[PDB]
Design a protein around this ligand. Structure first.
Ligand code: NA
Ligand code: NA
Ligand code: NA
Ligand code: NA
Ligand code: NA
Lengths: 215, 212
């Protein structure tokens, strides 16, 4: 029954402030402490502060004291963490975990990102370099490059060419994200039968195809 | 306060017993630290494993056992399974502050060692007119999920561009990933051979092309 249903992912510009909501279910709200931990990309977990419904009083990490603020909503049994003057290094996933004799059950986490600008990706085709088919199978791909934000969505021939597809993790190059997807088919389908990658970039209303043509 | 020292990454196999440690830099680790261990399964999924330097169950396997060694805490996994493969974080309490360890990355080999199929792509048409030449090296169906990717341009080992990613798992449980080589057209139109050689254990699978 216990559930720590955490609030939706965030995205803001520097100097902005966010408030994370952590609704809890499945246990008595007043019996346990709620902790607000911070996991930043690579640097892993970080304790921020904790509030005690059991005493009302809150406890903060001094390196966070002025940045974040913990409040409790007993009426709905919901904890909140406020983040102020957001900056680049404040970008991460924020978790709420309940007390006990350990950080027993955690929330699903809420991601917060601060940064720059929105940019649809510039998609490029990747075609075999005058090779052929060694296994009678050929691999074509698509360069989903320099976009913002995430995520990117890539399909091959409208999701009709589902097998053979490998869509890779985005990468941060010029403080924009570059991605990759690849399809493997027999050497008969290409180029006789059309092969196209459909990349959808949500934040920009983008839906663009890249027909792949032999060099 | 101090430095909670954890293993960076460890690997084991089903039926084996694994030992994880967590060191306190302030010294002897006691009950006043309330040593806690959490588990993070790779979906950025978190859960409590052991608290009170002892306490076991919310429904945590009997095989997971925590302890206090002397100047550090130890999480022993006796009879290690594949689903234990996750990231283990430790936490020591000094006052009024909580410090978590770096996190111990435990991989449980639960499938045969498979090798990567690499496919090198040269810069596209449309792209090269943008003064840019991105080479892409896809790495697919490799288990375990660890590879290093080396480039050399015209035999010249590359220290530039090299944007390799962390291996993401595939439907078949194996891993996939790619490495990018970006630079300018002039550079591109400057050499002949561009090679990507992938490292997955003691074998390097190279992949080249002579554009011109
Ligand atoms: Na598809
Ligand atoms: Na869209
Ligand atoms: Na042509
Ligand atoms: Na998992
Ligand atoms: Na067991």
């Amino acid at each position: 029954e216990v559930q720590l249903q955490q609030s939706g992912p965030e995205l803001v510009k520097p100097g902005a402030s966010v408030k994370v909501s952590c609704k809890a279910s499945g246990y008595s709200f007043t019996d346990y402490n709620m902790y607000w931990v911070k996991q930043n990309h690579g640097e892993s977990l970080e304790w921020i502060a904790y509030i005690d419904p059991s005493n009302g009083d809150t406890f903060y990490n001094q390196k966070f004291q002025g940045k974040a603020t913990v409040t409790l909503d007993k009426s709905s049994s919901t904890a909140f963490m406020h983040l102020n003057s957001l900056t680049s290094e404040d970008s991460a996933v924020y978790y709420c975990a309940r007390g006990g004799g350990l950080f027993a059950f955690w929330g699903q986490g809420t991601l917060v990102t601060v940064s720059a600008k929105t940019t649809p990706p510039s998609v490029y085709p990747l075609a075999p370099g005058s090779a052929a088919q060694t296994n009678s199978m050929v691999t074509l791909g698509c360069l989903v490059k320099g976009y913002f934000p995430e995520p990117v969505t890539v399909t091959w021939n409208s999701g009709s060419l589902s097998s053979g597809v490998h869509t890779f993790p985005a990468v941060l190059q010029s403080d924009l994200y570059t991605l990759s997807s690849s399809v493997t088919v027999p050497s008969s389908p290409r180029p006789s039968e059309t092969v196209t990658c459909n990349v959808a970039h949500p934040a920009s209303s983008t839906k663009v195809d890249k027909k792949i043509v032999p060099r | 306060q101090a430095v909670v020292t954890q293993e960076s990454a460890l690997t084991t196999s089903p039926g084996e017993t694994v030992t994880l440690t967590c060191r306190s830099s302030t010294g002897t680790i006691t009950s006043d630290n309330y040593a806690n261990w959490v588990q993070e399964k790779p979906d950025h999924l978190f859960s409590g494993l052991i608290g009170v330097n002892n306490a076991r169950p919310p429904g945590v396997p009997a095989r997971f056992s925590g302890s206090l060694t002397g100047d550090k805490a130890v999480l022993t996994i006796t009879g290690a399974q594949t689903e234990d493969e996750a990231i283990y974080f430790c936490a020591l309490w000094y006052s009024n502050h909580w410090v978590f360890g770096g996190g111990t990355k435990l991989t449980v080999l639960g499938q045969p060692k498979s090798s990567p199929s690499v496919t090198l792509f040269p810069p596209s048409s449309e792209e090269l007119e943008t003064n840019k030449a991105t080479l892409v090296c896809t790495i697919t169906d490799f288990y375990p999920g660890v590879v290093t990717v080396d480039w050399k341009v015209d035999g010249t080992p590359v220290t530039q561009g090299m944007e390799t990613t962390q291996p993401s798992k595939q439907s078949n449980n194996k891993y996939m990933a790619s490495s990018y080589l970006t630079l300018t057209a002039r550079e591109w139109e400057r050499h002949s051979s561009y090679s990507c050689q992938v490292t997955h254990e003691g074998h390097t699978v190279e992949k080249s092309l002579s554009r011109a």
